[model samples]
Target: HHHHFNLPPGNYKKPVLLYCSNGGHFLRILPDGTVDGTRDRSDQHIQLQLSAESVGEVYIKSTETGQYLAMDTDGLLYGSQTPNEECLFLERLEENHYVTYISKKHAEKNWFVGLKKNGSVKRGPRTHYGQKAILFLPLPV
Candidate 1:
């Protein structure tokens, strides 16, 4: 639900990354941050790391869990919990992980709560806050 853009080529300056997410998602520390979803997808840009190479593309989804990356692929990932049509949750322990809890149980998994780091994820916590289903937008590097 969150992503950061690396500085564009040219200028010789170090890349200054800015994280982006869907404002409606209501997740992450800066839940208000968002990208212009109405804009053309081709116009967006981002960086990715694959096979030890850094590629610049329009935001690629990282397989690393808890990394706020998007999932554009049609295939389903492991540990993905599709609880009813109302919502879906993917237990991804990657750098960019996306999880959606439509019912009350979803809130306890850190949907509304602000847990910045993965080390803070507590098990068997109570969650009752309700929310909509989630969709991950994993871009190619």
Candidate 2:
């Protein structure tokens, strides 16, 4: 199962996923908002992946022995309001090299093996993993 939100363009929103592991992993989000997992590198740390699907749903997958937390968009403390209303909080578990879903509303949680942090875009990319879309605009503040 997956939790998805209908967001409008020009909104300050972006999908964020947290991957934690004692030996690294990968995070993959499918076209239908279904998350997939895979093995990544060999490092005891966590990484963040952010993306917006071009059309219809999204996915998150890993390739290592760890868990992942996915959010529709990284909400802003104060900004022009929109219809997309979903929020979540994740805590990185440094003790076990893992992460915990501290709290979530209107989203889904997925667990996987490993997830790689490479091949991710910070911003300004038209195409990625065969997708061309933007859910929200990147706020400058």
TM-score on alpha carbons, each prediction: 0.20, 0.27
* Candidate 1 residue-wise lDDT at 118: 24
Write one digit per residue (lDDT tens) for candidate 2, span 1-141.
242233323221443333333223333433333443334433222223322332322222222322333444332111112213232332223223223322233324331122224423222122122121111111121
Per-residue lDDT of model 1, residues 81-102, tens digit only? 2223212332221223532222
lDDT of 1 at 113: 20
Alpha carbon lDDT at 73, candidate 2: 39
Best by lDDT: 2
Please name the candidate that would achieve the greatest TM-score relative to the true structure.
Answer: 2
lDDT of each: 0.24, 0.28
For model 2, the local distance difference test gives 0.28
